[PDB]
């Protein structure tokens, strides 16, 4: 289980509310999120062609 | 050995009657000995579900017979809930049917996936299957092999009856076999009742209720009207089980009563699903 | 018993080592009729704060926060599913909602946000949900509610899609190309080296996921 840098969370070690969360500014978590791992998929635009 | 190594199937269909030409696209799935294929009309870019039967598989004068049956009665239909026929053509090798396409599969597939569909889901389906199977009826036709797998749907969720090749207009073996087919008393619509009998039992219990491991045990249990509907469905729906699963065919009711029997007419019926409903309970 | 079947029955197919054959016919064993209803097309791991945000096939979205809930929206972009820490499901909307799930529709949004790039019969849409995931430096593992795990590979940018109720696997390849095999006609007709050591590390994937609950 060595190899598991991150998972979901189990629900009897884990906080029991996200109060104790504070709400970022849209942008602060935009780019945060840019620098946390993650795949969208991007699929290139052709321009009609 | 015994068989001609098989034909190589052209990547581009031609129908030299209408000049029309069909791009293969990709598999859909092999049923009997035929080849199903996503194809595309390269004037329209409409899309179609393309079977390909090789010719090598109709060699004998009732193969052959066969396969222009299910395509005359085919041709002769055109409703709702039954799978579009867009045409039939022929080379040496092959005989390309164009059928509407069903993208979100069969029956079968959301039976694996959901077991035990909820009330109003089961009167959906069975609802669209039934006003199918009225009109094949109301002109002459007997299915003789209605089952989850020839029950598709399309990206909307609507039921399209597909697979005529039992049928005839007034055999292979049935997935659902009658008790008068079995008993060898011939046999006439009521045998499409029969079925529809056990599609609904299917829907709302979870599993057949005939089939078992063992093909002997399962011709007992249909001569014998050996089956049982478990406690926890309601009694309308096991009353209306019962009717349809009745050993006597004089005593099923019609096609056309169906609609009006209370499970029909009464718990909530939904006119439209999404497809979310092909894989998980819906919101209700 | 989604986890547990599914192990099961990769097992079976790797116990018959489908790629050690003289000729191998991988394309006999394709079913298309078993393809996936949803996959997870994206997905940011924010679980250092917030949690594990996904989108699915059908562009609705989704969040497991790190309190053990999770908050699904439809593609309407307003109707929503919330799944309490004890499993109760409720169903609103983003118009209308507790005080308490506040919070969550805002990062929800925001999720939905940075991922992106109504007839009759809609109103019923319900959707899967996301159960448990782990990451590792190479791959995701994902595995929602109807029973699908996915694992996303890193490398290649490759995916496989299982389903133990059809007994399913479904390799997405490079070039975006989804093919979907029957395991039980991967046992008879084989495959190749490359879809059997994938079939092996699912294996191996699925035994973590059970591990950790």
């Not at chain 3, 940075?114 to 899967?128: K, N, Q, V, W």
Request: with cysteine; hydrophobic share 35%.
């Amino acid at each position: 289980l060595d190899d598991l840098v991150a998972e979901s969370p189990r629900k009897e070690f884990a906080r029991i509310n996200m109060d104790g969360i504070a709400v970022p500014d849209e942008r602060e978590f935009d780019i945060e999120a840019d620098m946390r791992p993650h795949e969208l998929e991007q699929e290139s635009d052709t321009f009609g062609a | 050995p015994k068989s001609a190594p098989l034909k190589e199937i052209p990547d581009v269909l031609v129908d030299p009657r209408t000049m029309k030409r069909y791009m293969r696209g990709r598999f859909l799935g092999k049923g009997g000995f035929a080849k199903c294929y996503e194809i595309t009309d390269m004037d329209t870019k409409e899309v179609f579900a393309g079977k390909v039967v090789p010719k090598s598989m109709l060699l004998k004068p009732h193969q052959k017979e066969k396969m222009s049956t299910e395509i005359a009665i085919h041709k002769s239909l055109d409703n709702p809930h039954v799978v579009g026929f867009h045409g039939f053509f022929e080379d040496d090798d092959f005989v390309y049917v164009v059928l509407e396409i069903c993208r979100r599969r069969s029956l079968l597939e959301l039976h694996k996936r959901r077991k035990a569909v909820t009330e109003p889901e089961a009167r959906y389906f069975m609802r669209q299957t039934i006003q199918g199977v009225q009109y094949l009826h109301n002109n002459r036709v007997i299915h003789r092999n209605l089952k989850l797998g020839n029950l598709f749907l399309n990206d909307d969720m609507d039921v399209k009856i597909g697979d005529f090749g039992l049928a005839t207009k007034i055999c292979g073996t049935p997935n659902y076999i009658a008790p008068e087919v079995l008993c060898k008393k011939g046999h006439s619509f009521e045998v499409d009742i029969w079925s529809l009998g056990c599609i609904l039992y299917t829907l709302l219990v979870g599993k057949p209720p005939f089939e078992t491991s063992c093909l002997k045990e399962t011709y007992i249990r249909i001569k014998k009207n050996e089956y049982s509907v478990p406690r926890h469905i309601n009694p309308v729906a096991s009353a209306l089980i019962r009717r349809m699963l009745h050993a006597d065919p004089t005593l099923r009711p019609s096609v056309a009563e169906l609609l009006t029997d209370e499970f029909f007419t009464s718990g909530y019926a939904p006119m439209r699903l999404p497809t979310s409903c092909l894989t998980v309970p819906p919101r209700f | 018993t989604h986890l547990t079947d599914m192990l099961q029955q990769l097992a079976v197919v790797n116990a018959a080592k489908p790629s050690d054959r003289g000729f191998i016919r991988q394309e006999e064993a394709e079913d298309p009729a078993c393809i996936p209803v949803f996959w997870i097309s994206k997905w940011v791991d924010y679980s250092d704060k917030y949690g594990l945000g996904y989108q699915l096939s059908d562009n609705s979205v989704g969040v497991l926060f790190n309190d053990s809930t999770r908050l699904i929206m439809c593609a309407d972009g307003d109707s929503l599913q919330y799944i309490d820490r004890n499993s109760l499901e409720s169903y609103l909307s983003v118009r209308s909602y507790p005080s308490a799930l506040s919070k969550k529709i805002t990062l929800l949004k925001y999720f939905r946000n940075y991922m992106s790039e109504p007839r009759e019969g809609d109103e019923l849409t319900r959707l899967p949900y996301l159960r448990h995931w782990f990451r590792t430096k190479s791959a995701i593992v994902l595995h929602l509610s109807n029973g699908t795990v996915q694992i996303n590979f890193f490398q290649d940018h490759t995916k496989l899609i299982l389903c133990p109720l059809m007994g399913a696997v479904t390799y997405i390849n490079e070039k975006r190309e989804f093919y979907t095999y029957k395991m039980t006609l991967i046992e008879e007709f084989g495959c190749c080296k490359e879809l059997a050591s994938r079939l092996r590390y699912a294996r191996n994937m699925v035994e973590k996921l059970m591990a950790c609950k």
